[PDB]
Design a protein around this ligand. Sequence first.
Ligand SMILES: CCCCCCCCO[C@@H]1O[C@H](CO)[C@@H](O)[C@H](O)[C@H]1O
Lengths: 260, 284
Amino acid sequence: ALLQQMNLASQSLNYELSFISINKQGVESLRYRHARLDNRPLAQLLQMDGPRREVVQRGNEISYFEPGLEPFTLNGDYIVDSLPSLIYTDFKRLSPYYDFISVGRTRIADRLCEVIRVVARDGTRYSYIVWMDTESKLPMRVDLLDRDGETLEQFRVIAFNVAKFSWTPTWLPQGFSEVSSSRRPLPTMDNMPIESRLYSDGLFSFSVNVNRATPSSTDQMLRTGRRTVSTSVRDNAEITIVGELPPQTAKRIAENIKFG
Amino acid sequence: ASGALLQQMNLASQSLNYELSFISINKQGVESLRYRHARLDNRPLAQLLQMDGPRREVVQRGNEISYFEPGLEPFTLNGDYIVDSLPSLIYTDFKRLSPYYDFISVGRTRIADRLCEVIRVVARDGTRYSYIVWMDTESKLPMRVDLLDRDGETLEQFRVIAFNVNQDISSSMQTLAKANLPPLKAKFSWTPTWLPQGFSEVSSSRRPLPTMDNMPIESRLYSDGLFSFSVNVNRATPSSTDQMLRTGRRTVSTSVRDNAEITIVGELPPQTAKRIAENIKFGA
Ligand SMILES: CCCCCCCCO[C@@H]1O[C@H](CO)[C@@H](O)[C@H](O)[C@H]1O
C-alpha cells in the first residue's frame, strides 16, 4: 500500500519510457515523456511503427497530430492510453472501499520491481497487478485482469530513462460517484434523445445511457478488453452500460435502475 | 400507376380521420397497438396506444409529440409524426425515389377482410432492403407492410387487424385537439467516398462521448427519403474492434482503420454498411 509514490513520481519527475501495449488486437510500440515546469505537466506519446502519430499534454491542452491531417486540441487532465490511468489514482479516497495487496518483487525490463495488486472490496470491479520500479517508483508494467484472472490489457515497459431524469440506478458497486449527467439527441431522423449518467470510483468509469425502447432494441452483451457494452430492454426503455465493468456487474446495474 | 397509389396512400394517411388496431411483428415478439388519427384545422392529430401491459401512450398535436405513462412525468418533444406507429414508409415522398426504386404492383389480396393493392418497393442498385405494401383499395390506407432484407426474409411486419375510417373527428381526438399538453454546420476531417445512389446528408454533429475524457465523436445522418442510417467516427481506442450486429431494421457495423472507430447505425444490409465504412477517406 504505497503506490501513491508511483503516482507522484509519474507526475512530479522527468522521464522517458519506450513501452509496448498488448491486447487482443496486436502489440504496439509506443513512447511517453513527462515533466513539470511551473507545476504544469508536459507529455508526448508516439507511434514508432507506421504513421508518426503524436499526442502532447500541456496543463489542460492535449493536442493531436499525425501525417496527412489537420492538428487540433482538446481539454484534458492527462493523456489517456499513453500510460496506465492507474497513475493518477487518488488512493487516499480509494482505499476506504478498496485494498492493496503486496505480492513480492520481480524483474521487469532488467530492473527490480515491487509487484502490487489492487482490488475492489466487494469484488465488483476488475483488477490490477502493477510492477513498480524500486529506484524511480515509475510503473514498469500494469495488468488489467478480469475476475477470472486473465489479462484484458497489458502495459509493459521495455526501456526506462531519466440534467434531470425519470430514472435512477438503485445499486452501485459502492465507490462510484455520479460524475455527471447529460441529454443529447441521437443521430436519427427523429433526433431520438438519449439520457446519460457518467460514473467513476476514482479508478474505473462507466456510463449508464437510456433511450425509449424501440422495436429493434434487444438485450446484448459485448466485451472487448476494458470496454463492456451491455444493453438491456425493459419498462419501455433501452439501457446501455458502457465502461470498465465485468458483464455480471454491468448487467446488475441495469437491473436496479427503477423509474419512479 | 403503382407510384401513384403509393402516393395516394401517403395523402389518405395524412388527410383522413381513422382508427387502426394493429400488430407489429419481429424477432422481439408481437405488439398490440391502436393508432387514432385526425386532421383538424389542417393540423395533425394522433394517438398511439399500447393495448397490452402498462398503458403507454404517445400523442401528436401539430409538431408536438407527448409521451404519457403511469408513474412517470409526461413530456413533449418536437416531431412531424409518431415514430414506430404507422410504417414510416407512409410518409415517403415517392416522387423523390422514382429514379432509384421500382414500384412494382404484385396484384391483389385480402387483409382484415378488405381488398388490397399489393405493391413492392425495391431499390434498383441492390444495396438496400425492400418493402411490400398491402393497400386498402377503397381508402388507400396501409393494411400491411413488410420490411424485407435482401434475401427476402421479413425483418418487420405491420399488419392491420381492425379498421375504421370516420367522416367526423372522434371525441378522443377532440379531447386531444386542445388539452394540457406538457412542456418540452460542423466540418469533419472525413468523407464517405461511397454511398448508394439517392442518399443525402441530412445532418452532422460533433459531441463528446459520456466518458471520463469526454472523447469526441462525429456523426453524419444520411437518408434517401425512405431509409436512414448514421456514420459515426470517434478516436480509435485500443479496445476498438470490428463488429456486425443486426436486429430487425437495425444494423450496427463497426470497423477500425486509420486510427478511427467507424460505427454505421441504421437500416442497411450488413454489406452496404461495410462498404460505406471501407470507403471513407481522410483529408487530402
Ligand atoms: C453512435 C450510436 C448511435 C446509435 C443510434 C441508434 C438509433 C436507433 O434508432 C431507432 O432504431 C430502431 C431500430 O433499431 C428503429 O426501429 C427506430 O425507429 C429508430 O428510431
